[PDB]
From Swiss-Prot, chain A:
Gene: rpsO
GO CC terms in record: cytosolic small ribosomal subunit
This protein's name: Small ribosomal subunit protein uS15
GO-annotated molecular function: rRNA binding; structural constituent of ribosome
The species this protein was found in: Escherichia coli O45:K1 (strain S88 / ExPEC)
GO biological process, one term: translation
Alphabetical list of NCBIfam families matching this protein: S15_bact
Record note on quaternary structure: Part of the 30S ribosomal subunit. Forms a bridge to the 50S subunit in the 70S ribosome, contacting the 23S rRNA.
UniProtKB/Swiss-Prot annotation, chain B:
Keyword Coiled coil: no
Classification via Gene3D superfamilies: 3.30.1370.30, 3.30.1490.10
Protein name per the record: Small ribosomal subunit protein uS8
Gene Ontology cellular component list: ribonucleoprotein complex; ribosome
One Pfam family here: Ribosomal_S8
UniProtKB keywords: Ribonucleoprotein, Ribosomal protein, RNA-binding, rRNA-binding
NCBIfam families xrefs: PRK00136.1 (NF001109)
Assembly and oligomerization: Part of the 30S ribosomal subunit. Contacts proteins S5 and S12.
Family: Belongs to the universal ribosomal protein uS8 family.
Curated annotation (Swiss-Prot), chain E:
Database matches in NCBIfam families: S18 (TIGR00165)
Name of the protein described by the UniProt record: Small ribosomal subunit protein bS18
Oligomer status and interactors: Part of the 30S ribosomal subunit. Forms a tight heterodimer with protein bS6.
Function: Binds as a heterodimer with protein bS6 to the central domain of the 16S rRNA, where it helps stabilize the platform of the 30S subunit.
Source organism, top-level taxon: Bacteria
GO cellular component, one term: cytosolic small ribosomal subunit
GO BP annotation list: translation
GO molecular function terms attached to this record: small ribosomal subunit rRNA binding; structural constituent of ribosome
PANTHER family per record: 30S RIBOSOMAL PROTEIN S18 (PTHR13479), SMALL RIBOSOMAL SUBUNIT PROTEIN BS18M (PTHR13479:SF40)
Family, as annotated: Belongs to the bacterial ribosomal protein bS18 family.
Pfam families for the chain: Ribosomal_S18 (PF01084)
Keywords: Ribonucleoprotein, Ribosomal protein, RNA-binding, rRNA-binding
Species assigned in the record: Escherichia coli O45:K1 (strain S88 / ExPEC)
Gene3D superfamilies xref list: Ribosomal protein S18 (4.10.640.10)
From Swiss-Prot, chain F:
Stored Pfam families: Ribosomal_S2 (PF00318)
Family annotation (InterPro entries): Ribosomal_uS2, Ribosomal_uS2_bac/mit/plastid, Ribosomal_uS2_CS, Ribosomal_uS2_flav_dom_sf
Any single GO CC term annotated in Swiss-Prot or TrEMBL for this entry: cytosolic small ribosomal subunit
GO biological process: translation
Keywords: Ribonucleoprotein, Ribosomal protein
SUPFAM superfamilies xref list: Ribosomal protein S2
Protein name from the UniProt record: Small ribosomal subunit protein uS2
Family note: Belongs to the universal ribosomal protein uS2 family.
Molecular functions (GO terms): structural constituent of ribosome
Length: 88, 129, 49, 65, 65, 218
RNA sequence: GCUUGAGUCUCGUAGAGGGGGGUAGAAUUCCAGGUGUAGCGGUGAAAUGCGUAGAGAUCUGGAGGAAUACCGGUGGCGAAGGCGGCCCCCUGGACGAAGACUGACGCUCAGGUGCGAAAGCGUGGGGAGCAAACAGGAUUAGAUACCCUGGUAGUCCACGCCGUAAACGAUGUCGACUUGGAGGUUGUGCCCUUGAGGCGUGGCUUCCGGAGCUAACGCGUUAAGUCGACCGCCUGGGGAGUA
RNA sequence: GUUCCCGGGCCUUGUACACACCGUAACAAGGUAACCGUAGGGGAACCUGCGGUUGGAUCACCUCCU
């Protein structure tokens, strides 16, 4: 269930506080962190007709979150894609 | 999901009379409060309370007659999907007058008769009987 | 030691337990007459043979 | 399972065997599986298991016979 | 109604089996969460621990094979 | 003082509290107090029990359940009212028009016994007029000579005799029904909530109704 | 620009949830050995078969194979389908006490994509039990039908294809609103968890009922009650959910 | 004495029945409960195996502990 002493390091970087993980720039990164440790499962085992609903779920959530940041703050979005590299 | 405040507020009115209460409280906006202003002058609402801090709790005291609803047959006509404009002479009357056709006019909030007083129409929000 | 012959085992308490209401006063157990009154009065319940 | 009792019997005493299962697992591993069957019959069984308690609630309020 | 589930808090262990004798019969049969005045949580966790006590030879399966 | 503090008729949880509002009251292991709605609702009760009597009114007492079944017979004999201490037969207000067929039958039996042929027939049949007439006592003796409708009916129960309340809503006649908090707020005109299955309330409420009839005619 | 909407983190729990592999024990088919009998099996009844070439039965050792009695609870997980030993690793989803924020980032659909019990088949292995086609004896005027003994396909492990259902609490989905009781299952905050609890809040599910709907039965906070948003379907049956 | 046997009544359960009890596969539990989905087969209904549901029936007797 998540890797706490890696993700807390992430909120330390992106956040202006330690309690501030409500800003778009920090939350999508914690979401990508989930995906960084999710690759480890979608590489092996092959028969996850259950774990598949998690993929489509968190990817949908992520696609539209960066889809709003794009429509409002291009300052934070271009800095965000340049801060984590979540574009590719 | 509570996208049309007006309609799901009239439900608090509908089921409110069916559940027999005395006071309803819904998220506020002074446009809805202006509707209650018109309703007090007519006798549908009694003493509207615009109490608010940072989370606007408009508290409206529901009125009865002889232990019966004065506002019983009420529903939405100009839906959030089907918003329909009306003129001044094609304008409808709830209960042919024994009820008010609440219309949002070019000035603020009034009735079918008060819209005749303005000489201009608009959104017949709902049929109030 | 009977409720039908004398009275409520407890204050307004029926023999069978049909009346576990300390509001019930007078109404008897229709099976056998248990007029519910305070059990303390059973220190004054006079019967006969 | 194993009943003994050194002397006061004058009887076989297999009452804990029946009090164990006896026909409990006999009726379950003697004939065809048919995975779904018990589920349905426990259905009619459960509704009739609440029915006697419904009869317990049916005897407490009136019965002024 | 018993002074043991009024002092029984947080997962009853699998080491000494003296109190496991108090949930099983002297046959190797477990008592359901309804007979024993114990919430399913507890009667069930005690149970899983007992299967592990079988992989450890604390309690056998049925009495005799 | 609140009548030795009994007014509140303890409320049994399974009471299903629609009446929850009006009752208020504390909650003791089951629940319990019907407070307010009970106490001051009798003052306005006294008011109407005076006015319907000012229009010449009688109270057909409708009581069952063995507890008040005794003061019903006495509170009726205490003033001038008719009573139903025994079983309140379903139809004694609506089907009463056809109960009248038997009322004329009862008034003809009262004839044969008093000034009839209770000494001009087989002892076998004379006793038939005897045992049956006593069945007319427990059934129709408290309405033997009505003719006209009473102006108010005292309904001892709603939790059990809501039908007695329903048939009243067929004549639209004043109902002075005492209730429990699993009953309907409709049908009753002057509700007197709270305790009703208490011998003390029997003395208290029923006596205060017959006595209030006594001053409307005065 | 501001928050009652959506969402994530700090701090935690439970689980027939899925996935790859390995392992424990009983029973069964069968093999070797000591003992031993003439019956075992089956059905309303008979019979095929086995039997002095010693079956069934008992004890010890053991190799394939599939599946987990008792714990089991109109209980739990999930989009649904569907799914009951244990361990190691991976991991999705649901929920909660107290705070921090961008500030409606929300809902759904033709073409499209993915899951898909069981079955059919191709392929490297397999066959204990049951058992399509079929054979023997009977019920029968007849058996390709209830029954029993055998038995190919299938069942299982891994990769794919046609891509189907009573895929049905028959109740489409996101969400708000609408007197209670018996409960069950899983967490949490407050008070002395002295104690088997009292007061509130979310998820799933069952029974009796008010409001309301209804042809009626009844559903009834998980609705068939009240609205808004998005899609599919129907115009009597059959033809046919087929060429 | 009502447990055996013939006829009768009341209550109750059940029905696609009310025109009203070549082979029985459904309607009483039709003496083998039903239907959908799939493969195969036989003059033919339907049956066999696997998954699901209730648009299914009685829970009445005979032996043991308080």
């Amino acid at each position: 269930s998540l890797s706490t002493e890696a993700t807390a390091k992430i909120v330390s970087e992106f956040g202006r506080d330690a309690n501030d993980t409500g800003s778009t720039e920090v939350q999508v990164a914690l979401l990508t962190a989930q995906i960084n440790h999710l690759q480890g499962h979608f590489a092996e085992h092959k028969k996850d007709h259950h774990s598949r609903r998690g993929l489509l779920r968190m990817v949908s959530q992520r696609r539209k979150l960066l889809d709003y940041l794009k429509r409002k703050d291009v300052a934070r979005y271009t800095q965000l894609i340049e801060r984590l590299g979540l574009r590719r | 999901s509570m996208q049309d405040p007006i309609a799901d507020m009239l439900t608090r009115i509908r089921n409110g009379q069916a559940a027999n209460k005395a006071a309803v409280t819904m998220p506020s906006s002074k446009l809805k409060v202006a509707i209650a202003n018109v309703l007090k002058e007519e006798g549908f609402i009694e003493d509207f309370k615009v109490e608010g801090d940072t989370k606007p709790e408009l508290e409206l005291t529901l009125k009865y007659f002889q232990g019966k609803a004065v506002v019983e047959s009420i529903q939405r006509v100009s839906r959030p999907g089907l918003r329909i404009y009306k003129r001044k002479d094609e304008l409808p009357k709830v209960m042919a007058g024994l009820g008010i056709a609440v219309v949002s006019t070019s000035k603020g909030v009034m009735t079918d008769r008060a819209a005749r007083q303005a000489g201009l129409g608009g959104e017949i929000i709902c049929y109030v009987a | 030691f009977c409720a039908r012959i004398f009275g409520p085992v407890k204050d307004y308490e029926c023999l069978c337990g049909k009346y576990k209401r300390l509001k019930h006063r007078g109404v008897i157990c229709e099976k056998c007459g248990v007029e519910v009154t305070q059990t303390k009065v059973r220190r004054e319940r006079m019967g006969h043979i | 399972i194993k009943v003994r009792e050194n002397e006061p019997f004058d009887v076989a005493l297999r009452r804990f065997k029946r009090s164990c299962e006896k026909a409990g697992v006999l009726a379950e591993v003697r004939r065809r599986e048919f995975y779904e069957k018990p589920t349905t019959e426990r259905k009619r069984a459960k509704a009739s298991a609440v029915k006697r308690h419904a009869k317990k609630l049916a005897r407490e309020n009136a019965r002024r016979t | 109604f018993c002074r043991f589930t009024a002092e029984g808090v947080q997962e009853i262990d699998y080491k000494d089996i003296a109190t496991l004798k108090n949930y099983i019969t002297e046959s190797g049969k477990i008592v359901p969460s309804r007979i024993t005045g114990t919430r399913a949580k507890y009667q069930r966790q005690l149970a899983r621990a007992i299967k592990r006590a079988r992989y450890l030879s604390l309690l056998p399966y049925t009495d005799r094979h | 003082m609140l009548k030795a503090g009994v007014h509140f008729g303890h409320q049994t949880r399974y009471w299903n509290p629609k009446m929850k509002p009006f009752i208020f009251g504390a909650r003791n292991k089951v629940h319990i107090i019907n407070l307010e709605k009970t106490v001051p609702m009798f003052n306005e009760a006294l008011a109407e029990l005076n006015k319907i009597a000012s229009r010449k009114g009688k109270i057909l007492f409708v009581g069952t359940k063995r507890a008040a079944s005794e003061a019903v017979k006495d509170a009726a004999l205490s003033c001038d009212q008719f009573f139903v201490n025994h079983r309140w037969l379903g139809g004694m207000l609506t089907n009463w028009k056809t109960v009248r067929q038997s009322i004329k039958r009862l008034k003809d039996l009262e004839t044969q016994s008093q000034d009839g042929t209770f000494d001009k027939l087989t002892k076998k049949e004379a006793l038939m007029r005897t045992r049956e007439l006593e069945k007319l006592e427990n059934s129709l003796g408290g309405i033997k000579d009505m003719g006209g409708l009473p102006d108010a009916l005292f309904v001892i129960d709603a939790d059990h005799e809501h039908i007695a309340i329903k048939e009243a809503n067929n004549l639209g006649i004043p109902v002075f029904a005492i209730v429990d908090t699993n009953s309907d707020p409709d049908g009753v005109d002057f509700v007197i909530p709270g305790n009703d299955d208490a011998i003390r309330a029997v003395t208290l409420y029923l006596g205060a109704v017959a006595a209030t009839v006594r001053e409307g005619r005065s």
